[PDB]
Amino acid sequence: MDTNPCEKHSCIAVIDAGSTGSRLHIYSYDTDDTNTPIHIEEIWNKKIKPGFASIQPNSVTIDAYLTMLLADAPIHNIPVYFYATAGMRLLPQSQQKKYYDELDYWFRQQSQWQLVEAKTITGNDEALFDWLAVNYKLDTLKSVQNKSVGVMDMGGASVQIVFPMPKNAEISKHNQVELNIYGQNINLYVHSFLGLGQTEMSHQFLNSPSCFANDYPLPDGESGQGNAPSCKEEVTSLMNSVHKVNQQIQPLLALNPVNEWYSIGGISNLASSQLFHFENSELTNQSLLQQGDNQICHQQWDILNGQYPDDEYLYQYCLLSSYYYALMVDGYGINPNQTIHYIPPEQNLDWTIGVVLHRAL
Amino acid sequence: TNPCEKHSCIAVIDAGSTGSRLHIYSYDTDDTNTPIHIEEIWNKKIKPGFASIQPNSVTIDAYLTMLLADAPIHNIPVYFYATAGMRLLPQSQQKKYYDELDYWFRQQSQWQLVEAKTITGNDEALFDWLAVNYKLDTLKSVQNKSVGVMDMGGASVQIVFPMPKNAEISKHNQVELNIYGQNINLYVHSFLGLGQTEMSHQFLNSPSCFANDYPLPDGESGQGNAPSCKEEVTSLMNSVHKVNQQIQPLLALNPVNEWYSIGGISNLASSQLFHFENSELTNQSLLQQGDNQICHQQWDILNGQYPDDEYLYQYCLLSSYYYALMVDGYGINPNQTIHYIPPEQNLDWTIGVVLHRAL
Numbered sequence: 001m002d003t004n005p006c007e008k009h010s011c012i013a014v015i016d017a018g019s020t021g022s023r024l025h026i027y028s029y030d031t032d033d034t035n036t037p038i039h040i041e042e043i044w045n046k047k048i049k050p051g052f053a054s055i056q057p058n059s060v061t062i063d064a065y066l067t068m069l070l071a072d073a074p075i076h077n078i079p080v081y082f083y084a085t086a087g088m089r090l091l092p093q094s095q096q097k098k099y100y101d102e103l104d105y106w107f108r109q110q111s112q113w114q115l116v117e118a119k120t121i122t123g124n125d126e127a128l129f130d131w132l133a134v135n136y137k138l139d140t141l142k143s144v145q146n147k148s149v150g151v152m153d154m155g156g157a158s159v160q161i162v163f164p165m166p167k168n169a170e171i172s173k174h175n176q177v178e179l180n181i182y183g184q185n186i187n188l189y190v191h192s193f194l195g196l197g198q199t200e201m202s203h204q205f206l207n208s209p210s211c212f213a214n215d216y217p218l219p220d221g222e223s224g225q226g227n228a229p230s231c232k233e234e235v236t237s238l239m240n241s242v243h244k245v246n247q248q249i250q251p252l253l254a255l256n257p258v259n260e261w262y263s264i265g266g267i268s269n270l271a272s273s274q275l276f277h278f279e280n281s282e283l284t285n286q287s288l289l290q291q292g293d294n295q296i297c298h299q300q301w302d303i304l305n306g307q308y309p310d311d312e313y314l315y316q317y318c319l320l321s322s323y324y325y326a327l328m329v330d331g332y333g334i335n336p337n338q339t340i341h342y343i344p345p346e347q348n349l350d351w352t353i354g355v356v357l358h359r360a361l
Numbered sequence: 362t363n364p365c366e367k368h369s370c371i372a373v374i375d376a377g378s379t380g381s382r383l384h385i386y387s388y389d390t391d392d393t394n395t396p397i398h399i400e401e402i403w404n405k406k407i408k409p410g411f412a413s414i415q416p417n418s419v420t421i422d423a424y425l426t427m428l429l430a431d432a433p434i435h436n437i438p439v440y441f442y443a444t445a446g447m448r449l450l451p452q453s454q455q456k457k458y459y460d461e462l463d464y465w466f467r468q469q470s471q472w473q474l475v476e477a478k479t480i481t482g483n484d485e486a487l488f489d490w491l492a493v494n495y496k497l498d499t500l501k502s503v504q505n506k507s508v509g510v511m512d513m514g515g516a517s518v519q520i521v522f523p524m525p526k527n528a529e530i531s532k533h534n535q536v537e538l539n540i541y542g543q544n545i546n547l548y549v550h551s552f553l554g555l556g557q558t559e560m561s562h563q564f565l566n567s568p569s570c571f572a573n574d575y576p577l578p579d580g581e582s583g584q585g586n587a588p589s590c591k592e593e594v595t596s597l598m599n600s601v602h603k604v605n606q607q608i609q610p611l612l613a614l615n616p617v618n619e620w621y622s623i624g625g626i627s628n629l630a631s632s633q634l635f636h637f638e639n640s641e642l643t644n645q646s647l648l649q650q651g652d653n654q655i656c657h658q659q660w661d662i663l664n665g666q667y668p669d670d671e672y673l674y675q676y677c678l679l680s681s682y683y684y685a686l687m688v689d690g691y692g693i694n695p696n697q698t699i700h701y702i703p704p705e706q707n708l709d710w711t712i713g714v715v716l717h718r719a720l
């Protein structure tokens with residue numbers, strides 16, 4: 001990296017305004033012959049909590065939030081994209097408008113940041129950016145691939161799945177994207193499931209004793225008595241009986257097999273806990289469920305709590321092991337022994353590189 | 362002028378998922394020291410819910426000052442009881458809220474904090490039944506009729522009705538009390554995640570649940586149909602939460618003669634879009650009205666006709682959901698009258714706290 005990279009290269013700011021927090025990235029890049037970004041490098045990152053949608057939108061609270069997120073950035077005289085995801089999608093457009101009206105005003109009140117767009121993106125666009133960001137980092141975009149790379153993003157309020165699929169006129173145009181990048185033509189199936197992110201899904205199982213460690217105090221006064229296969233079946237009812245994940249996804253994946261799966265989001269944080277044993281930043285769903293069942297679900301809560309003081313989400317590890325299995329295996333139909341790569345959480349790889357690439361197509 | 366110079370007074374705060382409600386009640390007591398002549402002498406309602414604020418001294422001070430500072434009466438005992446909004450957080454995160462709140466009360470002299478805690482859904486249901494029945498004057502003597510109460514919240518819903526003590530049901534779902542010389546045994550149940558905010562977050566991309574052409578968040582269009590929306594919501598009620606399996610056998614054996622409901626349903630039934638007489642509805646009518654007055658309407662047209670109702674966009678979903686809960690979940694006949702307490706009365710479960718602590 002150069003000293004003062006934005007005096008030597010193009011730079012752009014992209015803000016991921018997710019359900020659990022907002023993440024500013026500033027990227028330097030160069031461009032090739034088509035003015036498409038290459039050599040994308042993150043030169044600044046700042047993550048804040050809580051999520052944008054969780055604040056009361058008024059001039060004071062928006063100024064405080066945006067100052068916290070942006071003020072200390074090393075460079076401000078650059079284009080900014082503020083793209084909110086599933087947290088804002090939980091609100092009707094009428095309620096979201098207050099937020100963007102205050103946000104727009106704040107940007108127009110200052111003279112450095114160059115706001116390009118501030119909006120809530122659909123889960124389908126978020127999926128598209130998920131796939132581009134991961135494939136950029138894998139360096140699979142430059143050339144036509146021998147194998148199919150699928151991406152899953154596990155968020156707080158939505159989950160996305162995205163994989164290559166030729167154009168299919170029987171499938172909604174909203175769930176398909178054709179792009180041309182680096183002179184290659186790519187057709188993807190995209191899908192997002194709102195309500196199936198970890199925070200929203202969890203709020204339907206907090207009184208399920210099979211979903212918590214033994215003796216964990218459930219909110220309505222019963223005790224945990226964890227059993228991951230049992231908890232997973234409860235979560236599968238939400239996946240399939242309610243959202244119809246399997247009916248929508250499995251027929252398409254059967255016909256458009258994915259050779260390598262990469263996942264980003266909460267699953268990376270779970271799989272990185274010392275309660276689990278994984279190698280090479282990959283897991284299988286069978287191993288995740290069995291480890292969660294044995295090391296959390298059937299263990300005593302007060303012991304676990306004192307033993308893992310740094311795992312903030314420890315109380316949900318039995319649930320979350322069961323939930324990722326329910327989603328991937330019973331929902332998407334992925335084999336429980338199939339390798340799932342998870343991107344290390346220290347990489348802070350979200351979908352925002354996707355925006356850098358996609359705005360110039 | 363100041364009733365608390367001549368009568369006992371206490372303050373009870375309902376800290377719900379969507380806001381907090383301060384009530385100050387004056388009362389006398391009978392010869393068992395049970396409250397009688399309960400009168401509300403002050404109310405203040407604020408939003409948003411306590412569990413939604415960031416828990417630090419600055420934020421907690423602003424919230425509690427807004428809730429309490431302008432009350433005409435202080436120097437009285439305060440019970441702060443939170444419900445399903447705080448239940449959605451682990452104890453470790455809840456503790457930060459209560460440590461800050463505790464500090465705020467210790468740092469002032471006008472309010473006497475007695476207890477600040479999250480109550481279970483079962484306790485909330487008990488207080489639901491006592492509050493409503495106190496207001497109906499059905500507690501003073503043995504009733505010909507079984508009165509059941511439903512509380513429709515943002516994050517949980519409760520149901521509670523009389524049921525003789527049963528060794529085969531969890532002790533946590535049964536309450537025995539002795540009040541005004543009578544012995545009353547209730548079944549209580551709360552369903553966390555089935556309140557209207559939490560439920561709705563599983564159905565925002567269901568076209569059947571929104572008016573025609575309503576823009577769903579993931580880019581598809583509404584195409585409302587209340588019976589179809591109700592079927593979707595029923596799979597959450599019964600395939601996920603097993604409401605039918607848990608409640609229907611018990612109501613079959615313990616029929617309720619009169620149902621009373623509080624919470625969001627009162628707001629929906631009282632709205633400009635729905636038409637009910639005598640503060641009562643039937644589920645059959647509720648579903649039909651939602652279907653024809655919202656679901657099958659064109660969104661931009663209807664939105665422009667009814668600008669002053671923030672929940673208009675959810676009315677197709679809400680009418681479908683209450684039917685799914687009451688009919689497909691609890692087993693209530695679609696033609697059975699459901700009384701709803703008018704939203705103007707601000708009747709929540711807090712009178713139940715006034716009564717219960719003397720029992």
Ligand SMILES: [Mg+2]
Nearest residue numbers: 018019085155
């Ligand atoms: Mg995200």
Ligand SMILES: [Mg+2]
Nearest residue numbers: 377444514709
């Ligand atoms: Mg309530």
